[PDB]
Write an enzyme that holds these catalytic residues in place. Structure first.
Site, PDB file in Angstrom:
ATOM      1  N   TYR A 264      47.360  56.940  31.485  1.00 38.44           N
ATOM      2  CA  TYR A 264      47.246  55.634  32.126  1.00 38.44           C
ATOM      3  C   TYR A 264      46.561  55.735  33.480  1.00 38.44           C
ATOM      4  O   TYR A 264      45.950  54.763  33.940  1.00 38.44           O
ATOM      5  CB  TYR A 264      48.626  54.994  32.287  1.00 38.44           C
ATOM      6  CG  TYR A 264      49.209  54.419  31.017  1.00 38.44           C
ATOM      7  CD1 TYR A 264      48.487  54.412  29.834  1.00 38.44           C
ATOM      8  CD2 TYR A 264      50.483  53.872  31.008  1.00 38.44           C
ATOM      9  CE1 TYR A 264      49.021  53.881  28.675  1.00 38.44           C
ATOM     10  CE2 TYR A 264      51.024  53.340  29.855  1.00 38.44           C
ATOM     11  CZ  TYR A 264      50.289  53.346  28.692  1.00 38.44           C
ATOM     12  OH  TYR A 264      50.826  52.816  27.542  1.00 38.44           O
TER      13      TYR A 264
ATOM     14  N   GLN B 161      55.054  46.379  35.228  1.00 32.96           N
ATOM     15  CA  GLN B 161      54.712  47.793  35.351  1.00 32.96           C
ATOM     16  C   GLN B 161      53.202  47.997  35.353  1.00 32.96           C
ATOM     17  O   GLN B 161      52.667  48.750  36.176  1.00 32.96           O
ATOM     18  CB  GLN B 161      55.358  48.591  34.219  1.00 32.96           C
ATOM     19  CG  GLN B 161      54.667  49.914  33.915  1.00 32.96           C
ATOM     20  CD  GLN B 161      55.602  50.939  33.306  1.00 32.96           C
ATOM     21  OE1 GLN B 161      55.964  50.840  32.135  1.00 32.96           O
ATOM     22  NE2 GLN B 161      55.987  51.935  34.093  1.00 32.96           N
TER      23      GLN B 161
ATOM     24  N   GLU C 100      31.171  30.297  43.069  1.00 34.30           N
ATOM     25  CA  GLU C 100      29.951  30.476  42.291  1.00 34.30           C
ATOM     26  C   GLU C 100      30.253  31.099  40.935  1.00 34.30           C
ATOM     27  O   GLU C 100      29.668  30.708  39.917  1.00 34.30           O
ATOM     28  CB  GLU C 100      28.957  31.334  43.069  1.00 34.30           C
ATOM     29  CG  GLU C 100      28.586  30.772  44.429  1.00 34.30           C
ATOM     30  CD  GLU C 100      27.437  31.523  45.074  1.00 34.30           C
ATOM     31  OE1 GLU C 100      26.307  31.452  44.546  1.00 34.30           O
ATOM     32  OE2 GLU C 100      27.667  32.191  46.103  1.00 34.30           O
TER      33      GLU C 100
ATOM     34  N   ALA D 122      63.137  42.589  31.863  1.00 36.32           N
ATOM     35  CA  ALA D 122      63.248  41.540  30.857  1.00 36.32           C
ATOM     36  C   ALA D 122      63.435  42.072  29.444  1.00 36.32           C
ATOM     37  O   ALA D 122      63.676  41.273  28.532  1.00 36.32           O
ATOM     38  CB  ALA D 122      62.010  40.640  30.903  1.00 36.32           C
TER      39      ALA D 122
ATOM     40  N   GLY E 202      55.494  40.540  32.443  1.00 33.26           N
ATOM     41  CA  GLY E 202      54.112  40.104  32.548  1.00 33.26           C
ATOM     42  C   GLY E 202      53.897  38.705  32.003  1.00 33.26           C
ATOM     43  O   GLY E 202      53.113  37.927  32.554  1.00 33.26           O
TER      44      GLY E 202
ATOM     45  N   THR F 267      52.634  49.233  21.238  1.00 29.67           N
ATOM     46  CA  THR F 267      53.833  49.949  21.644  1.00 29.67           C
ATOM     47  C   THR F 267      55.101  49.113  21.589  1.00 29.67           C
ATOM     48  O   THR F 267      56.194  49.687  21.634  1.00 29.67           O
ATOM     49  CB  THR F 267      53.676  50.499  23.070  1.00 29.67           C
ATOM     50  OG1 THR F 267      53.386  49.422  23.970  1.00 29.67           O
ATOM     51  CG2 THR F 267      52.550  51.521  23.128  1.00 29.67           C
TER      52      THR F 267
HETATM   53  N1  LIG Z   1      46.162  49.866  30.747  1.00 30.65           N
HETATM   54  C1  LIG Z   1      47.420  50.050  31.131  1.00 30.65           C
HETATM   55  N2  LIG Z   1      48.432  49.328  30.536  1.00 30.65           N
HETATM   56  C2  LIG Z   1      49.715  49.509  30.923  1.00 30.65           C
HETATM   57  C3  LIG Z   1      50.017  50.422  31.922  1.00 30.65           C
HETATM   58  N3  LIG Z   1      51.351  50.407  32.112  1.00 30.65           N
HETATM   59  C4  LIG Z   1      51.896  49.509  31.266  1.00 30.65           C
HETATM   60  N4  LIG Z   1      50.899  48.950  30.513  1.00 30.65           N
HETATM   61  C5  LIG Z   1      51.080  47.916  29.477  1.00 30.65           C
HETATM   62  O1  LIG Z   1      52.391  47.388  29.560  1.00 30.65           O
HETATM   63  C6  LIG Z   1      52.986  47.284  28.285  1.00 30.65           C
HETATM   64  C7  LIG Z   1      54.484  47.554  28.380  1.00 30.65           C
HETATM   65  O2  LIG Z   1      55.146  46.577  29.156  1.00 30.65           O
HETATM   66  P1  LIG Z   1      55.465  46.838  30.712  1.00 30.65           P
HETATM   67  O3  LIG Z   1      54.517  47.874  31.262  1.00 30.65           O
HETATM   68  O4  LIG Z   1      56.889  47.293  30.895  1.00 30.65           O
HETATM   69  O5  LIG Z   1      55.231  45.427  31.450  1.00 30.65           O
HETATM   70  P2  LIG Z   1      56.423  44.400  31.817  1.00 30.65           P
HETATM   71  O6  LIG Z   1      55.968  42.965  31.699  1.00 30.65           O
HETATM   72  O7  LIG Z   1      56.859  44.680  33.234  1.00 30.65           O
HETATM   73  O8  LIG Z   1      57.656  44.702  30.823  1.00 30.65           O
HETATM   74  P3  LIG Z   1      59.142  44.989  31.376  1.00 30.65           P
HETATM   75  O9  LIG Z   1      59.232  46.400  31.902  1.00 30.65           O
HETATM   76  O10 LIG Z   1      60.136  44.806  30.256  1.00 30.65           O
HETATM   77  O11 LIG Z   1      59.473  44.025  32.485  1.00 30.65           O
HETATM   78  C8  LIG Z   1      52.276  48.308  27.417  1.00 30.65           C
HETATM   79  O12 LIG Z   1      52.055  47.795  26.126  1.00 30.65           O
HETATM   80  C9  LIG Z   1      50.948  48.546  28.101  1.00 30.65           C
HETATM   81  O13 LIG Z   1      49.930  47.911  27.369  1.00 30.65           O
HETATM   82  C10 LIG Z   1      49.006  51.152  32.525  1.00 30.65           C
HETATM   83  O14 LIG Z   1      49.266  51.964  33.412  1.00 30.65           O
HETATM   84  N5  LIG Z   1      47.704  50.961  32.125  1.00 30.65           N
HETATM   85  N1  LIG Z   2      12.409  34.495  47.717  1.00 26.46           N
HETATM   86  C1  LIG Z   2      13.700  34.441  48.122  1.00 26.46           C
HETATM   87  N2  LIG Z   2      14.578  33.717  47.385  1.00 26.46           N
HETATM   88  C2  LIG Z   2      15.878  33.631  47.741  1.00 26.46           C
HETATM   89  C3  LIG Z   2      16.328  34.333  48.950  1.00 26.46           C
HETATM   90  N3  LIG Z   2      17.643  34.080  49.072  1.00 26.46           N
HETATM   91  C4  LIG Z   2      18.002  33.282  48.034  1.00 26.46           C
HETATM   92  N4  LIG Z   2      16.948  33.019  47.240  1.00 26.46           N
HETATM   93  C5  LIG Z   2      16.944  32.182  46.016  1.00 26.46           C
HETATM   94  O1  LIG Z   2      17.685  30.974  46.199  1.00 26.46           O
HETATM   95  C6  LIG Z   2      18.226  30.575  44.939  1.00 26.46           C
HETATM   96  C7  LIG Z   2      19.577  29.906  45.137  1.00 26.46           C
HETATM   97  O2  LIG Z   2      20.278  30.606  46.159  1.00 26.46           O
HETATM   98  P1  LIG Z   2      21.626  29.978  46.764  1.00 26.46           P
HETATM   99  O3  LIG Z   2      22.563  31.062  47.236  1.00 26.46           O
HETATM  100  O4  LIG Z   2      22.316  29.092  45.758  1.00 26.46           O
HETATM  101  O5  LIG Z   2      21.058  29.166  48.030  1.00 26.46           O
HETATM  102  P2  LIG Z   2      21.895  27.971  48.699  1.00 26.46           P
HETATM  103  O6  LIG Z   2      23.160  27.702  47.920  1.00 26.46           O
HETATM  104  O7  LIG Z   2      21.046  26.721  48.740  1.00 26.46           O
HETATM  105  O8  LIG Z   2      22.258  28.373  50.105  1.00 26.46           O
HETATM  106  C8  LIG Z   2      18.357  31.834  44.103  1.00 26.46           C
HETATM  107  O9  LIG Z   2      17.742  31.625  42.831  1.00 26.46           O
HETATM  108  C9  LIG Z   2      17.609  32.910  44.861  1.00 26.46           C
HETATM  109  O10 LIG Z   2      16.623  33.501  44.013  1.00 26.46           O
HETATM  110  C10 LIG Z   2      15.309  35.102  49.703  1.00 26.46           C
HETATM  111  O11 LIG Z   2      15.606  35.731  50.741  1.00 26.46           O
HETATM  112  N5  LIG Z   2      14.055  35.105  49.236  1.00 26.46           N
HETATM  113 MG   LIG Z   3      58.624  44.784  34.204  1.00 29.09          MG
END
Ligand SMILES: Nc1nc2c(ncn2[C@@H]2O[C@H](COP(=O)(O)OP(=O)(O)OP(=O)(O)O)[C@@H](O)[C@H]2O)c(=O)[nH]1
Ligand SMILES: Nc1nc2c(ncn2[C@@H]2O[C@H](COP(=O)(O)OP(=O)(O)O)[C@@H](O)[C@H]2O)c(=O)[nH]1
Ligand SMILES: [Mg+2]
Ligand SMILES: Nc1nc2c(ncn2[C@@H]2O[C@H](COP(=O)(O)OP(=O)(O)O)[C@@H](O)[C@H]2O)c(=O)[nH]1
Lengths: 430, 214, 427, 427
Positions: free
Chosen positions: A215, A11, A245, A90, A137, A170
């Site tokens: 929710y 859910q 990365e 479940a 879940g 809950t």
């Molecule tokens: N943050 C958030 N939590 C949710 C929401 N809906 C359900 N939950 C969480 O889900 C828990 C209840 O279990 P379910 O939502 O039924 O999840 P499930 O694994 O499908 O359980 P079953 O219905 O028995 O199959 C609650 O304790 C909530 O923490 C939501 O909309 N937002």
């Molecule tokens: N000065 C400068 N530094 C860059 C630029 N693009 C990337 N870097 C630097 O390159 C470093 C590593 O980048 P990364 O994505 O891992 O490059 P690559 O994996 O070798 O292709 C980072 O610390 C950036 O600060 C740029 O256009 N100018």
């Molecule tokens: Mg369920």
């Protein structure tokens, strides 16, 4: 070009999936019918005529939540195959969701996921959503994760799941299910993010000034984080950041992988006029414990590695000054054996707002995912709650009758104890 | 001071020179601001925008340079409030010398006035006696007399000199030159402010201009 | 080719220096924008003394601006001749002045000193020659008294040969603008005596007095007071800039007027000065100028010469006049008033003549002298210092910076010996 | 006829390469469509240095582009000069960058290497002569550091004689954009020392510092940062392209600047640099050019020369100018600062003059130097590497690719010996 497949179970997963996909359509400019009034290939496939079809799969063992989409406005967008519904849920039982009822449908859903992968020439990873307390879940998610690990191997399986809240709860049987799902997730998952509702309620009340959240409000805030992470791949930016990365920098060990989430600026319409919200303001707000989407204080622990993603009007020179000021904070802790700790990403596409939404139109925004030992505080709380219930054997009969052998209970307890040791020996210093 | 010089000449005891209290006490809060740029051969300085400040309580000119991002120039107060004398006239600067389109030599540097604040234009309009450049009745009467002398229909002039059926400041200057009379840029802007039916007086309409022309 | 470097430190020095550059620009005919629009070829002969040339036919002055707070620079940018200064020459801090000698010398002085010196080194080594430096600062303040002496010490180390001529304003004895001046003044003097070759002392009260007596001003501003100071500024360096019958530069002035290494504090004065309505009726001649120069009221420092005795004196004349007339007056003024000169040095009056006078004046004169009347000035600050030094509590502000109290005892001891030094030479 | 082959790798290499190809297109005057529309016949004398000619008078550059993911490639396609590059010269993979040196070198490096080599072989064997190769890549990343060094070794095997001059980006010491940099940098160092003849190190922190100090840009973007780097590549090869009073190509540079095979890391600097509003006050000439070149702030690598000593240095001057004034400056700057040069090598400063300066600038200069101050740079990455290596965890991501842990010990050992190599020659 390169593709990401989203998988939703339970859910909560479907509910978050609703919020996430409405944001994708608005950002890319796609009507709910799939027509238009770029990065479309990343999340969508071109059906041949004007309609676009998304790369998502919705799974639940009960039809109510899935049937809301089937009768909803967005029903035209999705393929009937992507919407998979079971017969009976479940009932908050890991054993029922893993062995008896889960195995009735596991191979049906896996075919559809694999079928979607055939069209993904440049598939680079998966996104999976859970609710730990729910039976589907945890029980069904574990069975799906174990299969996908051998089906595809070295393909990133990133997870964004709902951790049980420290005090708000809950379901009574919640501590049982979460520990059982912990064992299956820790070995197979490449990286899994944590959020909890208790932290979101406080954030959705204080910063965003709404007294009575539902929710629905929480799901949109979750949607913003997923869009920010995928933005570096979808759109142009001075520093592109890929999934691989993210995987290399964030996790220092195999078993330490668990990061935490944060987002800034999160503000209402009124306060926006009073603050310029430059790079310095948004970066500083990301580090206060109040903004954490996991209700744990980082000051209890230390920081291993962090990643920042910037969107909108951001200049690379100003980023370095902001992070350098962060380094001067004595209020923040880092381990000596990891001096650098940061990767930064800058993307030009600004955030997209939602009609009837909760967020103002900020020109620039930043998202942070970081690894910290503070999560060990959360694991201890769940561990203590489980021991009291298992000491008197409060719910064992329900699990055993549905295929579970009781030997699983001590084993899942043991691995969590080993994991708590892992976070402690990392926190040690030389 | 030079005021003390006049005191020394007038009396054997140089009794202090009286400041005009009536002007100071009435016009203490009245400030006119004008936007201007340098007329200089240096390409860098020519692109610098300045705001001129004239204080009526004591007839001083103050020039400020607004900060511009990625300009590389240390902006700020470019000239303090000063009791400057006009090199062209040999007399201290007065408010009547400040006209839009009139080039002013300040600090023996050459400044061209571009735009004026809403209060400065309104105050100049409210007192036509001290600001002939804002006296619209004189401009209207001269415009009507020139049209009668030239014998040219205003509608044909509007058709000839308007771009997209609208008259710019340059267009109005062209019409005035076609009649045979000058118009100052301040006078044209006063015409636009009074007559143009838009919130921002940048252009004139055919019936509106005909009302001004007839 | 005897280039001179000008440095402005603090609130007091910058305002006077800004008025100083107006006079020099006017005399040479330099546009506020830096273009040359003068009227004589003689102005272009030796403009290199004060100015550098830019690519676009502009002229940039050898000026360096120093202060602890940005407030003073922004007014200079608003100055009439503000554009003339080189943009990079503006070096400023980001802290309050504090009006503290210890804070200016130690805390913020070290940070600014390294940045300022390399700015100075740019101008110092960019010219074919460099005779001496020219500093404008106040002693009663905190920025120019503290940091100005610090840069004075460093300039001597790098350039021992060059003449470190400075112009200073002394705290007034009746009413002054800062309570803690005798602390700031006493500490500064110890640095001033050993390091600087030539020091001219200026008192604001006398500048009030002369404006009221002669110029007859009831609303004089800092413009008039700084303008009078700017006259002696141009006169001393005028010998380098223009031809004349008898040339006399700084090193000539130091050799003649300084009999011993420490007796070098000087008093200055300018002529002619007249009430601006009565100037028509004045029969201005060479003897008339001599009357003003030796008149005690025209002295810029409030230390009456008649109460002490003279050791050396020097006067300059600008304009075309008679050589015999100039020389005769100095013989007459020396013999007529022998009671105020030492017997053991004859010919106590030095002379010089310059061809080109300043604008508006058919001729003008400048007077610089040394006398034992300075013992009055040091007595006023020393007597005050003892009173508040017993009340050691003001030191606590200086203690927090890191100043050790024996520096107060050391500085007064040097000043006391300087007072005694002028006492013994009266005999 | 001294054709130079340009090779770009990774994210940083393309964006720097993309900006670099704009400048030389401007200097020769090449329209973005590839047609010549310049203004002087001198531009067509030796256009063969950088550009090839097609059937339709359409000049195509000798450029090869390499990347692991197409995200960087498509941005170049939409660039202003995107149409210029040869369509088949774009070689790219279909896998994520990974930011892993082991993955870039071994897994995806081998697949691309064979295809890339034939692409270079097309350009290498299509010219009457071929002087050397020119690589632009990043060391902190995974694609440029990993795959670039793999291509560098193969190029040496086929063409031992040619000069393998490269331009590299050094990880920043204060705050950097990647956690795993010390692994990637150290592993790349071992390959670079033995293979590459000439390596220029460029740091971003200096680039930000230069823009803030000198150019007064409040928001300097990568467009500005890459542009400052873009001058240096144009200046070095200019001697090939244009006549002058004393020609000095790459092989002359290596002979003079490299005393020993392993000491060849260099620092570079460019002059003149002036704020857009400050230029009117400057008097740009040869003596002013020399001031910026030897000033430590203009250096593009965060290694203060005063902390070390120099061994060799070379300077180029562009513009019609007296040869005598250039030669005198080399003598004065060497004799004035003898404390920073080795006694056992006289004439440590090379000079060369070329006729035609770049657009807008009446004369420009380029500085390339070698000094022991690089010991600071390698100490920073060594100290971080040991903290990396003791916590053996990050090795996990490298082992899965197939890298043996002995390589990390080998890489640090060779680099450690490089540090002491600079130490002993200081004596
Ligand atoms: N943050 C958030 N939590 C949710 C929401 N809906 C359900 N939950 C969480 O889900 C828990 C209840 O279990 P379910 O939502 O039924 O999840 P499930 O694994 O499908 O359980 P079953 O219905 O028995 O199959 C609650 O304790 C909530 O923490 C939501 O909309 N937002
Ligand atoms: N000065 C400068 N530094 C860059 C630029 N693009 C990337 N870097 C630097 O390159 C470093 C590593 O980048 P990364 O994505 O891992 O490059 P690559 O994996 O070798 O292709 C980072 O610390 C950036 O600060 C740029 O256009 N100018
Ligand atoms: Mg369920
Ligand atoms: N004559 C004169 N004195 C000034 C001027 N500006 C400031 N002063 C005096 O300088 C004295 C000390 O000022 P201060 O700012 O502390 O000087 P600084 O700190 O050494 O630069 C005060 O008594 C002021 O009256 C000026 O323009 N002219």
């Amino acid at each position: 070009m390169r593709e990401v497949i989203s998988i939703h179970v339970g859910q909560a997963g479907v509910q978050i999936g609703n919020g996430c996909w409405e944001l994708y359509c608005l950002e890319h400019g796609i009507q709910p019918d799939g027509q238009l009034p770029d990065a479309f290939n990343t999340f969508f496939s071109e059906t041949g005529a004007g309609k676009h079809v998304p790369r998502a799969v919705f799974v639940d063992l009960e039809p109510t939540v899935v049937d809301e989409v089937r009768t909803g406005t967005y029903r035209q967008l999705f393929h009937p195959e992507q919407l998979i519904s079971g017969k009976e849920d479940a009932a908050n039982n890991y054993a029922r969701g893993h062995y008896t009822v889960g195995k009735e449908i596991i191979d049906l859903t896996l075919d559809r996921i694999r079928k979607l992968a055939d069209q993904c020439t440049g598939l680079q990873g998966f996104l999976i959503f859970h609710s730990f307390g729910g039976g589907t879940g945890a029980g069904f998610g574990s069975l799906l994760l174990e299969r996908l690990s051998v089906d595809y191997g070295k393909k990133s399986k990133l997870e964004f799941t709902v951790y049980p809240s420290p005090q708000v709860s809950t379901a009574i049987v919640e501590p049982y299910n979460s520990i059982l799902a912990t064992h299956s997730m820790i070995d197979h998952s490449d990286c899994a993010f944590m959020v909890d509702n208790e932290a979101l309620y406080d954030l959705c009340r204080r910063a965003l000034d709404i007294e009575r959240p539902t929710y629905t409000n929480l799901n949109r805030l979750i949607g913003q984080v997923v869009s920010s992470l995928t933005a570096s791949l979808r759109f142009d930016g001075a520093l592109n950041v890929d999934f691989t990365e993210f995987q290399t920098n964030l996790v220092p060990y195999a078993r330490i992988h668990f990061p935490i989430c944060s987002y800034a600026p999160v503000i209402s319409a009124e306060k926006a006029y009073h603050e310029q919200l430059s790079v310095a303001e948004i970066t500083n707000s990301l580090f206060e414990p109040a903004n954490m989407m996991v209700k744990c204080d980082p000051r209890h622990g230390k920081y291993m590695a962090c990643t920042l993603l910037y969107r909108g009007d951001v200049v690379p020179k100003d980023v370095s000054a902001a992070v350098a000021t962060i380094k001067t904070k004595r209020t923040i802790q880092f381990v000596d054996w990891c001096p650098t700790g940061f990767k930064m990403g800058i993307n030009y596409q600004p955030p997209t707002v939602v009609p009837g939404g909760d967020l103002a139109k900020v020109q620039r925004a930043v998202c942070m995912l970081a690894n910290t030992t503070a999560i060990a505080e959360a694991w201890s709380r769940l561990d203590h709650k489980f021991d009291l219930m298992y000491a008197k054997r409060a719910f064992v009969h329900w699990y055993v009758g549905e295929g579970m052998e009781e030997a699983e209970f001590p084993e899942a307890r043991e691995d969590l104890a080993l994991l708590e040791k892992d976070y402690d020996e990392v926190a040690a210093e030389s | 001071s030079d005021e003390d010089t006049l005191r020394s000449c007038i009396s054997l005891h140089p009794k202090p020179a009286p400041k005009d209290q009536v002007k100071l006490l009435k016009h203490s809060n009245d400030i006119l601001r004008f936007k201007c740029h340098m007329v200089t051969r240096n390409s860098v300085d020519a692109s610098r925008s300045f705001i001129l400040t004239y204080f009526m309580a004591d007839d001083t000119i103050q020039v400020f340079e607004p900060p511009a991002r990625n300009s590389g120039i240390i902006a700020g107060k470019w000239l303090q409030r000063t009791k400057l004398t006009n090199p062209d006239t040999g007399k201290p600067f007065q408010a009547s010398d400040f006209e839009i389109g009139k080039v002013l030599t300040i600090n023996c540097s050459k400044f061209q006035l571009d735009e004026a604040t809403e209060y400065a234009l309104s105050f100049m309009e409210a007192d036509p006696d001290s600001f002939p450049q804002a006296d619209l009745n004189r401009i209207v009467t001269d415009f009507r007399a020139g049209l009668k002398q030239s014998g040219k229909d205003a509608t044909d002039l509007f058709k000839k000199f308007a771009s997209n059926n609208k008259i710019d400041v340059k267009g109005l200057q062209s019409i005035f030159e076609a009649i045979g009379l000058s118009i100052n840029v301040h006078e044209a802007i006063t015409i636009f402010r009074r007559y143009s039916t838009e919130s921002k007086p940048t252009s004139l309409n055919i019936r509106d201009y005909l009302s001004f022309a007839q | 080719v005897r280039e001179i470097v000008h440095i402005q430190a603090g609130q007091c020095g910058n305002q006077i220096g800004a008025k100083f550059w107006e006079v020099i620009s006017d005399e040479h005919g330099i546009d506020p924008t830096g273009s040359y629009h003068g009227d004589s070829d003689l102005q272009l002969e030796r403009i290199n003394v004060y100015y550098n040339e830019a690519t676009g036919g502009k002229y940039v002055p050898r000026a360096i601006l120093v202060d602890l707070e940005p407030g003073t620079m922004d007014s200079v940018r608003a100055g009439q001749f503000g554009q003339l200064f080189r943009p990079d020459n503006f070096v400023f801090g980001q802290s309050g002045a504090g009006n503290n000698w210890a804070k200016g010398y130690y805390t913020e002085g070290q940070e600014l000193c390294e940045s300022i010196l390399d700015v100075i080194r740019k101008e110092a080594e960019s010219c074919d020659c460099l005779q001496g430096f020219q500093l404008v600062h106040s002693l009663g303040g905190g920025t120019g008294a503290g940091l100005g002496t610090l840069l004075l010490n460093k300039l001597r180390e790098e350039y021992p040969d060059r003449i470190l001529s400075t112009y200073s304003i002394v705290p007034s004895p009746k009413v002054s603008d800062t309570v803690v001046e005798p602390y700031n003044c006493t500490l500064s003097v110890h640095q001033l005596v050993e390091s600087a070759d030539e020091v001219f002392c200026i008192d604001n009260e006398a500048l009030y007095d002369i404006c009221f007596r002669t110029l007859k001003l009831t609303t004089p501003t800092y413009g008039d007071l700084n303008h009078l100071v700017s006259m002696v500024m141009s006169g001393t360096t005028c010998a380098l800039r223009f031809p004349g019958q008898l040339n006399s530069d700084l090193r000539k002035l130091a050799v003649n007027l300084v009999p011993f290494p420490r007796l070098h504090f000087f008093i200055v004065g300018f002529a002619p000065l007249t009430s601006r309505g009565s100037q028509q009726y004045r029969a201005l001649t060479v003897p008339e100028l001599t009357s003003q120069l030796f008149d005690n009221k025209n002295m810029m420092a409030a230390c009456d010469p008649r109460r002490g005795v003279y050791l050396t004196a020097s006067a300059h004349f600008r304009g075309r006049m008679s050589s015999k007339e100039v020389d005769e007056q100095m013989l007459n003024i020396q013999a007529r008033n022998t009671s105020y000169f030492v017997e053991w040095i004859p010919s106590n009056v030095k002379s010089a003549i310059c061809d080109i006078p300043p604008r508006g004046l058919k001729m003008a004169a400048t007077f610089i002298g040394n006398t034992t009347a300075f013992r009055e000035l040091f007595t006023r600050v020393d007597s005050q210092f003892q009173k508040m030094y017993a009340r050691r509590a003001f030191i606590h502000w200086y203690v927090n910076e890191g100043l050790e109290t024996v520096e107060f005892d050391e500085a007064r001891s040097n000043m006391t010996d300087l007072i005694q030094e002028y006492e013994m030479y009266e005999t």
